[PDB]
Amino acid sequence: KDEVALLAAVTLLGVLLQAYFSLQVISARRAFRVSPPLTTGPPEFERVYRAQVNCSEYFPLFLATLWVAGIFFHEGAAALCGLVYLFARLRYFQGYARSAQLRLAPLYASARALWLLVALAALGLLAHFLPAALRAALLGRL
Amino acid sequence: KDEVALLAAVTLLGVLLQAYFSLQVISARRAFRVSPPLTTGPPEFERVYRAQVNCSEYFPLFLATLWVAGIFFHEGAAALCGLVYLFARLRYFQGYARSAQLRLAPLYASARALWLLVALAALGLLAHFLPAALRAALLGRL
Amino acid sequence: KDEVALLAAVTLLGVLLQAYFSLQVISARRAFRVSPPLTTGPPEFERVYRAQVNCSEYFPLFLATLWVAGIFFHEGAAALCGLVYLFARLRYFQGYARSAQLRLAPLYASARALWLLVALAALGLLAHFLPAALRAALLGRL
Ligand SMILES: N[C@@H](CCC(=O)N[C@@H](CS)C(=O)NCC(=O)O)C(=O)O
Ligand SMILES: N[C@@H](CCC(=O)N[C@@H](CS)C(=O)NCC(=O)O)C(=O)O
Ligand SMILES: N[C@@H](CCC(=O)N[C@@H](CS)C(=O)NCC(=O)O)C(=O)O
């Protein structure tokens, strides 16, 4: 509870953001009179819809690496990248909605932020496994 | 293990439900002869497909707030909302499949249940951070 | 940290794989000149796109049962099924991309692997709840 409080905070933040994306899609459906089960129509809608879906399919990847990084590398560092990513995603959604081209900048920022969490998670896990493994390897060649 | 057993139970339940949604979509594909990579056809299919996809994109949001709420607020309360939500989602899927209109009632029930988890998670995290922060704020104005 | 290190490893692996699926879809978009917010075009593209989406909607189910199984049943066993599943998913993506029929074999392997995690998670949770419940049931009929 004490060692994961920040990660949980970022996580909740992330959820709130996804919730926001949804409300926006619901509003797009209304504005452009696009009723389910339809997911296609004017590009101005399709973009808003696609921005929400794209963010939704990366969320688990975010939550996953956020927690692994926070637990095996550094909680504060993992949480900071969590924010930077979450912010980049907001900018992505908002940009994408205006123009498909305006999604790129924010998309890249997201990748960089997400790739850090992955690199950190990797470095964390590596630090946890490698030593013990190398010692077991040496002990073997006794 | 002892402090999260209920959350894990609800979680497993949630997975089983998603698994159920999938089998249903697979059955829809068969019934309406809609082979991949197609995701469009008769509305009777599209609804079933969309019900499964909509539940799938909220699942992470569910799992996320379920665990944060269960860990920072109250496990039993978080687990109860987990059920209420999971049930609302079943009703959503089943309703949506019949009619796009029959998805609304259950959809709202889902939102309410999900919003609770978020409110609880928020209250939990707030209780964990606020005090320490306020004391640090006061100590500063010494 | 020590009791979940393998699960976190498999998890990170899983993320890396999803990241791989994405890059592939981005490459498909380029190859077949399919720019967002479009998600339809030549079947050779649609399959690649659908393979990535299908893997993305099961990921949370994977992560969920992976951790519940690893925590309530056996970490090493849960991690092994994690690999077997993750491998089956790679084979699924790669097969699907070539042909919709080549996705079936790997898809089934995925189901089997995933169903194990669910069975294990169930057995784990059952072992944690059942006894205490039965004793409470007997104590009642005192
Ligand atoms: N589901 C995504 C996976 C690949 C991806 O993330 N692509 C980036 C760069 S091409 C994107 O912003 N795609 C727009 C979208 O997914 O709607 C897709 O189909 O494009
Ligand atoms: N992916 C959803 C996000 C918004 C949402 O959850 N909408 C609710 C109320 S309009 C719904 O049931 N949508 C039907 C669906 O997603 O198929 C969408 O595109 O509609
Ligand atoms: N979202 C999936 C859920 C059902 C599913 O997983 N189906 C399997 C066997 S029919 C599959 O490989 N579907 C191809 C796909 O989802 O693109 C769908 O719409 O088919």
Author numbering:
A (entry chain A), B (entry chain A), C (entry chain A): 2 to 143
Excerpt from the paper describing this PDB structure:
LTC4S catalyzes the conjugation of glutathione (GSH) and leukotriene A4 (LTA4), which is an unsaturated fatty acid that is involved in eicosanoid biosynthesis. There are several defined DDM molecules per 17 kDa monomer of LTC4S and the biologically functional unit of LTC4S is a homotrimer. Dodecyl-β-d-selenomaltoside (SeDDM) is a seleno-detergent with a β-glycosidic seleno-ether in place of the ether moiety in dodecyl-β-d-maltoside. Crystals of a nuclear membrane-embedded enzyme, leukotriene C4 synthase (LTC4S), in complex with SeDDM were prepared and a multiwavelength anomalous diffraction (MAD) experiment was performed.
The SeDDM in the LTC4S crystal exhibited sufficient anomalous diffraction for determination of the structure using MAD phasing. There were three selenium sites: two were found using SOLVE in PHENIX, while the other was manually picked from the anomalous difference Fourier map. Site 1 was between helices IV and V and helices IV* and V* in a twofold symmetry-related molecule. Site 2 was along the transmembrane helices I and III, and site 3 was in the active site of LTC4S. The alkyl chains of the SeDDM molecules were surrounded by hydrophobic residues in all three sites, indicating that hydrophobic interactions are involved in the binding of SeDDM. The SeDDM molecules bound three sites in competition with DDM molecules; therefore, it is possible that the DDM-binding sites were not fully substituted by SeDDM. Site 3 is the putative LTA4-binding site in the active site of LTC4S. The alkyl chain was inserted into the valley between helices composed of hydrophobic residues, including Leu105, Leu108, Tyr109, Ala112, Leu115 and Trp116 of helix IV, Tyr59 of helix II and Val16, Ala20, Leu24 and Ile27 of helix I* in the adjacent monomer. The electron density of maltoside was located next to the thiol group of the GSH. The position of the SeDDM alkyl chain in the putative LTA4-binding site was clearly defined.
